[PDB]
Amino acid sequence: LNYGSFTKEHVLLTPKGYREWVFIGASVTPNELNDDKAAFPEFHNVYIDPTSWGHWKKTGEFRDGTVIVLELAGVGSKASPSGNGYFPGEFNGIEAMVKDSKRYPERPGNWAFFGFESYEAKQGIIQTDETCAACHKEHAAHDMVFTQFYPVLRAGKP
């Protein structure tokens, strides 16, 4: 069973309950290390939908219907009782990508990339290839997903 809800025009309605999907990794690009403004501010928490996670554990490939959600959060602080570093604050928004060779036959890897204007938006905004796919295609380790930063995925494949 596929976890996206889509319009007929193949646009991803804003996902709900993605925090109960399978987390695959977190990174941080702080503003202070990026001319005070990282491109994607400031802690990517990444989830894959449960059905595609099951397929991933079995095959090491992204199924048709795969939905991946990246959730942005602020740096809330840089020192805590456990030491110095980066610690999360408040949520900032989400981005998503969907693999579907049937909905997106002309897109690279059959991936559609979605930006979201806000958490209250009813749907994502499909992106042209120059805005997202070009970088992912050039640099992601496996099928346009940056699996070099997802140790859960790497440990879960057969």
Place this chain on the structure above:
Amino acid sequence: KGLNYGSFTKEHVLLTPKGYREWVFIGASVTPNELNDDKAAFPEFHNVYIDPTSWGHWKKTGEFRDGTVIVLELAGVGSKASPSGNGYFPGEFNGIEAMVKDSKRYPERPGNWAFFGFESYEAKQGIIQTDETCAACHKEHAAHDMVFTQFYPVLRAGKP
């Protein structure tokens, strides 16, 4: 009634948890070695999970029930620059640590919390910790019932 996710020896020690990466993620932090004189206490990334049943109870109550298991999985820094910018990006897993709240199993421990370290991923069970090794620090600084929920935006968004 929900499932129990923790398993215990006769001495009420938590056996090394499996499948916890399919529990509900509540937040991630990073304490890099390079920002702590080349020796972080807990290297480096921290990915934190709460078991699914206590998450269900949390969404309803904003409290940690008896039987709550939290797993902190440690990972290395894999890199410091990527196409998305500069910062910290994870590498490989380092180990795990856990805490279990249970008023019948641990009646005299602070907060009824048992803190567990793990010698390796292949170990049969955790090692229960003295109050001074872990509980003392958690008690001093955690926002709610010895869990550092100030760093778990999933929990804060999840309370009713």
